[PDB]
C-alpha cells in the first residue's frame, strides 16, 4: 500500500445529466405573393388571396430549412406552395374583425379563422392609399396531417400564425 | 373597394412553433479533497474517501450554479458537502475493477458501484510514484430523494459520474 | 465445464425502456354561481359574472384534485374562488360574438377574450325563455403566474376553456 | 334585456390542459434459443450464445408489438433475429462477474458488458445440475443506430436489459 495526493490541476470531479428545454422556432417566408382588396370607407376586406413559396422558408438556420422541404415536412418537390383564400370577413369594428379562409398545406385544405387587427389606414404623401394590418391565429398540424411522423411531444401540434402587412394602392 | 400591393420590405409572413430539445448538462466541482491509498504491486485501492464542496459547482453558467445551492437542489446552507467513502474494491485485472462505496448527498446515503479504470501507473521523473485512474457510474436522483420537486421528465433521473484523477505519492 | 438447456418456463428474456406520453387532462367545477343578463331581441349579453369554487374541481381522479388545492397550484386556503367578469360583448351575428372580461385566478387578474357561440334561443314549454350558449378560449398559465413551480414542458402553458351553459329565465 | 339562472344539471364549467407522462415500457421475447456452457467447479461461464426471434416480442399490447416489426424499428422482414455472443467472462466471485459479448440488432453489431449475478447453483432432485443466473446492463439505441427516426426525447436512448435464466444440464 502507498499514499497519494490528487493533482487538482489534472483532476476533474465530473458529472453529466440530461435535461429538456422548450423553445419557440420563429420563421417566415422570403417569397410569397398576394392580392388585397380593401375598402377604407368601411374597413372591410373584400378579397385576400396569398400564395407562399415553401422553398423560401427561413427559421434563421440553413440546415433545418432544407429539412423542412423533405417528405416528413413540406414535400416541396410535390407541393411547392401553400395558399390562403379568404371566404368571409366579419367586421367587429374599424380596428378588429374575424377573417375566415381556406388554408392549403401540402394539398390538404381546411378552413381557418384569423384575427384581423388594422394597425393603420391612411392616404399617403402622394395622395394614394395605404394600410397596415395584421392576421393572427393558431392552426393545428394534426388538422392538416402535417409532419405526421414527428410526435406532438417533440414539436407542438399548434402553429401560431402572425402575418404582419404594410401595403399601398395599385396602378 | 380598392386594390393594394404588399410592400414586401415591411411585410413579414410569420409563424412560431414550440419544440423540445434534449441536452447534457456537464459539470464538475472546483473545490474537493481526497485521501487515496493504492498498492501498485497489485493494482488495488485500499482506501478512497472524497469530500466535495457543493458550493464549488460549475456547469459553465453563473446563474444555474446559484440555483443548485437552493432548497429544490443541494440545500448547501444545511448540507454544504457531499462525500464518498470506499467500502470494497474488487479487482478485475490491472486495468479494471469494481469499486463499492457510500455516497452521501444532502444527508441521504446510499451504496454505489463505480467502474474503476486505471489509465496509468508509474514511477515518476524523481523516482516517486504516480497513478492516473477514472471512476465511472450512473446514480439515480430518486435513490437519494434529490431535487424531488423537479420531474424525471424535465431532468433525467440518471446522473452519470465521471471522476478523472491524476495523483502523486505523499510526504 | 458442463452444458445446460434453458427452462423456457422460468426464463424471461426481458427489457425496460422509458417513453413519454402526452395526454389532455379534462376537468370541470361542480360548484359555481353566475349572473346572466341576455337580450333575445338582439342576441347580446349584457352582464355575465361567474364565481367558481376552486375546492369543487374534478378531473376524474381523487388525489390530483387535492393536489390542485395546494401552494404549487390554486392555494385554495388563501384564494378559495376564481371569478370572471364580463366587460364588453361585441356581437358578430346571432350565433357568434366576441366576449371580453376579467379573469381572476389566485388573486391575479387579466382580461381575456372568449368566443361566444349561441347554440339555441327559445321560449319554453311554459312560455318562459331559455338559452344554450358556449364560451371558448385559450388562457396562458404564465399570464396569471399560475403553478410557476411546474415547467411549461411537463404541463402545457395553455389552458383551454370550454364553458357549456343551459339557462332559463328568472322569478 | 332579461335575466337567466343556470341549469346546473346541463351546464359544464370545463377546461382541458395538456400534460406529459413518463412510463417504462417493459417487454420480453416468447421465442429464443440459447447454448449455455458453465463450470460449477469455478462459477465461470465458458460459452453463451443466444438467438432471439424479433417476431416473438411482447410488451403486453397487441398493436405496438406489430409496430416494432416495421422499418422504423426492428425491420423483422429483413432482420428476423437478434443475437448475443459471449466473448469473455471475467469472474468477480462466485455470485458476480462481468460478461462481454457481441450484440447484433438489425445487422448492427457492438460489444456490450452485462453484469452476471448467479442466483443459485445446485445438483437437482435427480442428481443432475441446475443454475439460475441473471444478466443485466444498459445498451444505447444510438450505438446500434436503432429506431433512428424516433427522437431520444419521446423514447429513451437507454434500453435496460434484464435476462433472468433458470437452466438444467443436458442429454
Ligand atoms: S422573415 C423572418 C426571419 C427570421 C425570423 N426569426 O427571428 O427567426 C422571423 C420572425 O421572428 O418571425 C422572420
Ligand atoms: S471542471 C469542468 C468545468 C466545466 C465543464 N463543462 O464543460 O461544463 C466540465 C466537464 O465537461 O465535465 C468540467
Ligand atoms: S364536470 C366534468 C367531470 C369530468 C370530466 N372529465 O371527463 O374528466 C369533464 C369534462 O370532460 O370536461 C367534466
Ligand atoms: S415475458 C413478459 C411479458 C410481459 C411483461 N410485461 O410486464 O410487459 C414482461 C416483463 O415485465 O419483463 C415480460
TrEMBL record, chains A, B, C, D:
SUPFAM superfamilies: YceI-like (SSF101874)
Residue ranges of domain Lipid/polyisoprenoid-binding YceI-like in the record: 3-168
Pfam families tied to this protein: YceI
Keywords noted in UniProt: Signal
Keyword Lipid metabolism tagged: no
Domain of life: Bacteria
InterPro entries: Lipid/polyisoprenoid-bd_YceI, TTHA0802/YceI-like_sf
Protein name, UniProt field: Periplasmic protein
